[PDB]
Amino acid sequence: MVDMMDLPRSRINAGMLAQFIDKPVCFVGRLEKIHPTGKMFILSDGEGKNGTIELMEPLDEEISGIVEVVGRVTAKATILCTSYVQFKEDSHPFDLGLYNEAVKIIHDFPQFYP
């Protein structure tokens, strides 16, 4: 076993979850809902699709908006989150459609983006 923090974490959207099972991934989305026990939530990407986030301990911090999480793709087409961070949008909005287009670009020609 090796720590996932020191691996090439990929960046993807909700729609690609079916082809990256068990590998580390990086997910960007806007918060949608929180399971009432504070142990699950769901994010959405530019296309509007959704992916679920699972955790290990209850969350004592309220989180909303664009969310940044990293984890391992489980067998249920889900993300087993290890860490999360939330951007700052206090002065500008995040053009999430532009980021989705950029992410679509990376996997089109990975030679220039190893």
């Binding site: 020191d6 664009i66 961070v85 053009d95 532009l98 670009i105 190893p114």
Partner: protein
């Protein structure tokens, strides 16, 4: 950071692929930092390889995105960066633009050398 650690060292000037580089800039998230009487070292992570090291001579708190520009160094065959300046992002679209800037830059020169 994925392509920096893969750079060759010849006659004091580092090369990547078919292009030379001496001054570079990247964007990532701080992971940890320590204080020294003469300089500071940050572990900048951009989620495509292990946290690189950047050194600045005489502090941004952790988990913050930043943009850096500096020089590439090798010491005991270990890659590192010496940074002229480090600036936290304010608009979060900067790194989304940077992701496309990188693919444009490291793709335009390739055909020129062809």
């Amino acid at each position: 950071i994925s392509q920096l650690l893969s750079a060759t060292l010849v006659d004091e000037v580092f090369r990547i692929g078919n292009v030379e580089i001496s001054q570079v800039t990247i964007v990532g998230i701080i992971r940890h930092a320590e204080k020294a009487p003469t300089n500071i070292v940050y572990k900048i992570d951009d989620m495509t390889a292990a946290p690189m090291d950047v050194r600045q001579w005489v502090v941004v708190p952790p988990e913050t995105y930043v943009k850096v520009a500096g020089h590439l160094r090798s010491f005991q065959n270990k890659k590192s960066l010496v940074a002229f300046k480090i600036m936290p992002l304010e608009d979060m679209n900067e790194f989304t633009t940077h992701i496309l800037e990188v693919i444009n830059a490291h793709m335009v020169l390739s055909k020129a050398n062809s």
